Amino acid sequence: LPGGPVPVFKKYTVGSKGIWEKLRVLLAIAPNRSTGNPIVPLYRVPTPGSRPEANVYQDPSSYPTNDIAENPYWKRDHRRAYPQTAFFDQKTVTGLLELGSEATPRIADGEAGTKALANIANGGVSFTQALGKSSKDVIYGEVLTVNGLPPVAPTLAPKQWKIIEGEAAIYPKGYPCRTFH
Amino acid sequence: KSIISYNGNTIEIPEEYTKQAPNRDSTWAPAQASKTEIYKNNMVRFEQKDLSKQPMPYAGIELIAQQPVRFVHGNTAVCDGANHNGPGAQGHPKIFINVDAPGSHACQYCGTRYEKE
Amino acid sequence: TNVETVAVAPTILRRGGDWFASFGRERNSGTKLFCISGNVNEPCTVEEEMSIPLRELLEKHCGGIKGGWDNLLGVIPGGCSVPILPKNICEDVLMDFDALKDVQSGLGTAAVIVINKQQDVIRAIQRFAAFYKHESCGQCTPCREGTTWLLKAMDRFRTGQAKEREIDMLYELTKDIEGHTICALGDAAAWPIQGLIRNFRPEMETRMKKFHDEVGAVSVGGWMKDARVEKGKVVGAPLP
Amino acid sequence: AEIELTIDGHKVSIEAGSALIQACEKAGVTVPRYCYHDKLAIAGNCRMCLVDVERAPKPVASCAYPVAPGMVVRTDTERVKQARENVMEMMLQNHPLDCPVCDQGGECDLQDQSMRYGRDRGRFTEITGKRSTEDKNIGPLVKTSMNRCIHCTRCVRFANDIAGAPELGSSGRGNDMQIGTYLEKNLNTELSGNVIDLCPVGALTNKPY
Numbered sequence: 010l011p012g013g014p015v016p017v018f019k020k021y022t023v024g025s026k027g028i029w030e031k032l033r034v035l036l037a038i039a040p041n042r043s044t045g046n047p048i049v050p051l052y053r054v055p056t057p058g059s060r061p062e063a064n065v066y067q068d069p070s071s072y073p074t075n076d077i078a079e080n081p082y083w084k085r086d087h088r089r090a091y092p093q094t095a096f097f098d099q100k101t102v103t104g105l106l107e108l109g110s111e112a113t114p115r116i117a118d119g120e121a122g123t124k125a126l127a128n129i130a131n132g133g134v135s136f137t138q139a140l141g142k143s144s145k146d147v148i149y150g151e152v153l154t155v156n157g158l159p160p161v162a163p164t165l166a167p168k169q170w171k172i173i174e175g176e177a178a179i180y181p182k183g184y185p186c187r188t189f190h
Numbered sequence: 191k192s193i194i195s196y197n198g199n200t201i202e203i204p205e206e207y208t209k210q211a212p213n214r215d216s217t218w219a220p221a222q223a224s225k226t227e228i229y230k231n232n233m234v235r236f237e238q239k240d241l242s243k244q245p246m247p248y249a250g251i252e253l254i255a256q257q258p259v260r261f262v263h264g265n266t267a268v269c270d271g272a273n274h275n276g277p278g279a280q281g282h283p284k285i286f287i288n289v290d291a292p293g294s295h296a297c298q299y300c301g302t303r304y305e306k307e
Numbered sequence: 308t309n310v311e312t313v314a315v316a317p318t319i320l321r322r323g324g325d326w327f328a329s330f331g332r333e334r335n336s337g338t339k340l341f342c343i344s345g346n347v348n349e350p351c352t353v354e355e356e357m358s359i360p361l362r363e364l365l366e367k368h369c370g371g372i373k374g375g376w377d378n379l380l381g382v383i384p385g386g387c388s389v390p391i392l393p394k395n396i397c398e399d400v401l402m403d404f405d406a407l408k409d410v411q412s413g414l415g416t417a418a419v420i421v422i423n424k425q426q427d428v429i430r431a432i433q434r435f436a437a438f439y440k441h442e443s444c445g446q447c448t449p450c451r452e453g454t455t456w457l458l459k460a461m462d463r464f465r466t467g468q469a470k471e472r473e474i475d476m477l478y479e480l481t482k483d484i485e486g487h488t489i490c491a492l493g494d495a496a497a498w499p500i501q502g503l504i505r506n507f508r509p510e511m512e513t514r515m516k517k518f519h520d521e522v523g524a525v526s527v528g529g530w531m532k533d534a535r536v537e538k539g540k541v542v543g544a545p546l547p
Numbered sequence: 548a549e550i551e552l553t554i555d556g557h558k559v560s561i562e563a564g565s566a567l568i569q570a571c572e573k574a575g576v577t578v579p580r581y582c583y584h585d586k587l588a589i590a591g592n593c594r595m596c597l598v599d600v601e602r603a604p605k606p607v608a609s610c611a612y613p614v615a616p617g618m619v620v621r622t623d624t625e626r627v628k629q630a631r632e633n634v635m636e637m638m639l640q641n642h643p644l645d646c647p648v649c650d651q652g653g654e655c656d657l658q659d660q661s662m663r664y665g666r667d668r669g670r671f672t673e674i675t676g677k678r679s680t681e682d683k684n685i686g687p688l689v690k691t692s693m694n695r696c697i698h699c700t701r702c703v704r705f706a707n708d709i710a711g712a713p714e715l716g717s718s719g720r721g722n723d724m725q726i727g728t729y730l731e732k733n734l735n736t737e738l739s740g741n742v743i744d745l746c747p748v749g750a751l752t753n754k755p756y
């Protein structure tokens with residue numbers, strides 16, 4: 010309906026003459042049909058070897074990029090600012106349970122806090138031991154959700170769906186394919 | 191003309207084709223391999239074949255030597271070899287030449303020799 | 308040691324040293340010879356006190372300015388390795404080490420070089436750039452590359468073959484040179500540009516806007532649309 | 548008799564009185580350079596080993612800063628990361644456009660060095676251009692295109708001190724500095740060709756190869 014049928018004088022096609030056009034309007038399935046040949050003095054003129062637009066053409070560029078004075082490279086660097094591959098042992102998750110988090114730590118006594126760190130960093134405790142050690146609020150805070158629900162397998166950008174159905178659909182009913190979007 | 195085909199037998203090609211070039215008869219590289227070596231190597235796949243319709247591609251060492259040696263008013267010359275008709279970036283890149291020593295100095299891409307005067 | 312600071316030494320042993328310290332600032336103490344020149348009435352050199360106003364200096368002990376206190380445009384305290392003080396600061400500034408560093412500048416050798424308003428500051432700084440080009444040794448890659456870079460920048464700025472961005476391009480090149488030299492000559496090479504940048508930024512633009520309709524428009528780097536490389540040298544561009 | 552300090556968190560101990568760049572080599576933190584060398588005298592001409600030093604007003608060269616205890620060496624200060632791009636860019640405004648004809652194509656120390664730390668662009672687009680240097684005939688062994696030289700002094704200190712042919716030398720100030728005899732006379736010490744492995748650009752290179 011914004012992309013519906015348009016008549017054949019806006020289709021850029023070789024067309025017809027005028028008594029044969031009057032013939033073929035009476036003899037066609039739809040009159041608004043192109044015979045497929047593009048129009049010769051329009052399509053591919055002037056040839057790409059001779060384009061007057063191609064004579065002056067320096068460079069496409071953007072303003073914070075081509076700015077000579079202000080930026081250095083290292084602010085607009087992108088290859089050396091990659092995120093690190095965050096790896097997690099079995100053991101460091103036990104560290105995340107009992108020692109706590111940078112949001113909510115559970116550790117004072119920064120001298121002996123290193124000692125409480127290090128045996129777990131050497132394998133003093135086990136994970137299931139920490140699970141029994143972890144409180145109900147600990148499990149429902151940093152393992153499950155606040156209702157104690159399992160986290161849904163998370164998605165980048167969730168795309169909710171419409172179903173276009175009516176005359177804006179690409180097939181009417183009877184045809185089995187629907188056109189959701 | 192007549193060169194020995196490794197057996198005392200001589201092979202006989204005209205002097206129009208004992209040539210490095212239509213512009214030059216002599217070689218210009220240490221491992222140039224003159225045509226007198228080449229027909230000596232494989233005339234096996236050269237028999238029953240025309241001698242005319244091979245390239246003979248007009249070697250460059252004769253053509254560069256008859257270009258006029260240009261003059262530069264100041265000290266440091268610039269060479270591009272780029273046309274001023276072609277809308278683009280052609281020629282060799284913008285290197286500079288010091289011309290101070292007695293004698294001309296070829297721009298190491300284009301081979302045009304420049305002189306300080 | 309400076310010949311001056313060792314030639315003052317016998318007198319200051321002969322006189323009172325704290326008596327010498329009874330002058331100027333607490334720290335910036337005593338006297339200095341002031342080689343005062345530029346466009347004055349009386350080019351002279353006086354042995355006078357530190358921490359003194361420039362106006363009382365010039366108006367009383369070097370005659371005046373050719374065209375008066377109006378006709379100054381800027382002043383260079385010290386040698387050439389000092390940024391130019393503009394008109395509003397130079398009226399009420401002491402000649403010590405403190406106030407000039409406070410206006411981000413050096414007292415130098417306390418030569419005073421005043422500048423005619425009816426003359427060209429861009430010539431005055433371009434000559435300093437080529438002064439440094441004749442007198443860089445060549446240990447530092449920054450200094451040796453720097454001053455021949457600065458010189459062609461200043462010539463292009465003098466005729467006006469630049470764009471408006473390129474003056475701050477030069478400012479970043481100034482601080483590129485500044486802290487990265489073995490001897491302090493790069494520090495010397497830096498500051499006369501920064502005086503021009505901080506105090507004459509529309510003044511350069513007036514020359515450049517003038518050049519923009521003297522001839523056709525210019526691209527970056529001085530290249531014009533007809534500035535081309537023909538047989539041998541370049542053509543089109545009028546060679547700063 | 549040894550000194551332990553900190554380079555980028557890495558504590559490292561090295562013999563006293565040595566150079567900081569050897570401590571950076573010992574710590575494993577790679578610091579680029581152009582005119583340091585082990586077997587040669589130390590000159591700070593290259594300006595590449597700039598590095599941040601606690602208790603220092605400005606970043607200093609790591610080649611000639613002597614090792615002092617209680618040292619905190621930082622290499623990734625944004626001032627230093629600015630500085631390396633700066634100095635590379637300053638070096639690359641008189642070096643000529645010879646990368647497809649220069650001999651050290653993949654072996655240009657400068658070039659691989661200018662890929663990590665070089666600028667995107669280079670704003671040399673001045674009209675009247677770079678300097679340029681005489682051919683400087685030396686001998687039938689050493690190919691010589693002094694235009695590509697950067698005066699990194701690494702040739703002349705060697706032929707001075709260890710090779711013992713003191714004919715090489717620096718003549719002139721600024722861009723009028725050259726390297727070599729301006730007699731145009733033949734160099735020979737009995738290890739003559741060792742400079743073409745030593746000039747990190749292809750200013751001096753191999754004449755038969």
Ligand SMILES: Cc1cc2nc3c(=O)[nH]c(=O)nc-3n(C[C@H](O)[C@H](O)[C@H](O)COP(=O)(O)O)c2cc1C
Nearest residue numbers: 308309310311312313416442490491492493494495
């Ligand atoms: C490039 C440069 C050039 C200098 N030229 C001079 C000079 O010509 N006469 C002078 O007395 N000091 C000159 N100085 C400053 C000297 O280094 C100065 O003698 C020293 O730093 C301090 O000496 P003093 O205690 O006697 O003031 C120059 C400094 C630099 C960085």
Ligand code: SF4
Nearest residue numbers: 444445446447450488
């Ligand atoms: S600042 Fe001094 S040492 Fe460095 S290159 Fe310039 S003149 Fe030489």
Ligand code: SF4
Nearest residue numbers: 645646649655748749
């Ligand atoms: S030394 Fe310079 S010109 Fe030669 S290949 Fe390396 S970067 Fe290119």
Ligand code: SF4
Nearest residue numbers: 696698699700702746
């Ligand atoms: S001759 Fe070669 S190694 Fe020596 S300073 Fe010059 S470019 Fe460097």
Ligand code: FES
Nearest residue numbers: 582583593594610
């Ligand atoms: S070797 Fe460190 S500055 Fe040249």
Ligand SMILES: [Zn+2]
Nearest residue numbers: 269297299300
């Ligand atoms: Zn050329």
